């Protein structure tokens, strides 16, 4: 059924979101970030104020 297809899609999305939630945050979301911790020249690419 179409409902079953939608349910499968939500299962895929929930798996992906669970993996994101357990996964360690990106470098920009540690609060204090050091030059060594982040990738080299990351700030140039990113937009910060």
């Amino acid at each position: 059924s179409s409902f079953e297809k939608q349910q499968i899609e939500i299962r895929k999305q929930i798996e992906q979101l669970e993996n994101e939630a357990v996964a360690e945050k990106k470098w920009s979301l540690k609060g204090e970030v050091k030059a060594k911790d982040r990738p080299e020249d990351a700030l140039l690419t990113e937009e910060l104020e």
Partner: protein, 148 residues
Amino acid sequence: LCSPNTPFCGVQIVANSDTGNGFRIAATGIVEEIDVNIEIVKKLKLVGFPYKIFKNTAFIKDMFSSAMEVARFEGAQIKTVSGIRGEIKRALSKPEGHYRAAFEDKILMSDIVILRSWYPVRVKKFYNPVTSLLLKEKTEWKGLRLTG
């Protein structure tokens, strides 16, 4: 979306299996505005140390991996943990990432200077309507689980 002033209530668990004993009503609130986009921002702090000090002037390291990063952040407002304010004056050619800074008062080697900055954040486009009536049991609907 909805008209503003529309009240709503929130619940973290709807299935009977996870009801437990605590109260299930999690949040209450009023919709204030409806839009297509939002500009949530998060605080991001860059951390380094001084290694060479001349009264107000000092040289700092570990903020930036290359002088290129320094170039983007000249004139940036910085301060110590002690609260002494300052400025990113100029990137030193050698070594990469080292830069000169001036401060209102002399800093101690043990102190740590920090640059305050703001990082944009995005809202996750996740939509999972509750469809209990479509299920056989009609009382064990389960969606995205809590982080815990």
